[PDB]
Amino acid sequence: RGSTSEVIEDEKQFYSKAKTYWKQIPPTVDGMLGGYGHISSIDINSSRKFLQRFLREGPNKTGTSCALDCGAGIGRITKRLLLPLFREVDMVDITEDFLVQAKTYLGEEGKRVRNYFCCGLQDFTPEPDSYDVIWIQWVIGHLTDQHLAEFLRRCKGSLRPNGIIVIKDNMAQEGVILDDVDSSVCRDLDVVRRIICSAGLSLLAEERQENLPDEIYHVYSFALR
């Protein structure tokens, strides 16, 4: 199947099953990464190289005052990617336990986290003209195709001048694959590009993550605005 409408028989249960899953996951890096904590540094290093280009190379350079971490969990990305590069960071996540642990996990640099929003992305509206970078990693599979498009549109309205949205996620080989355990979908490159392009966002960069374990789905980063 090629859409969520086909693989998601009950949209209400698609969301409630995912909320239930994450509510009893340990608030640790291994919990965030499904046992793949050993690739966290490899992931963060590529994300930094991918992002530093928009921040260093003009013209129309991306600012460094504020970033939003979407589906942030305990702040794995906020801690090692975003806080070293942006003056302040906002986090949003559906799981209360992760936002609470983030205060401890982030340590002293976590004092630069401005807001800990507790919300599903499908219900979340980032404030207009607020963010230089909106980072969306390993969470787009928890939204339906339509909710993802609408969320990206709301994100576009919250970007400051020259700001970007970044999506980094697993890509399926073909079509849309449903994961029954965590209640998320995996989409192929064509589906994701169509959702993005079809929602009114411009695709600026696209990069496959190298050096990942052989056994996992491929991971891609997209920069959009």
Binding site: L33, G34, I177, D179, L212, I216, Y217
Partner: peptide, 6 residues
């Protein structure tokens, strides 16, 4: 997060 190809 990262996942084994099912």
């Amino acid at each position: 997060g990262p996942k084994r190809i099912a």
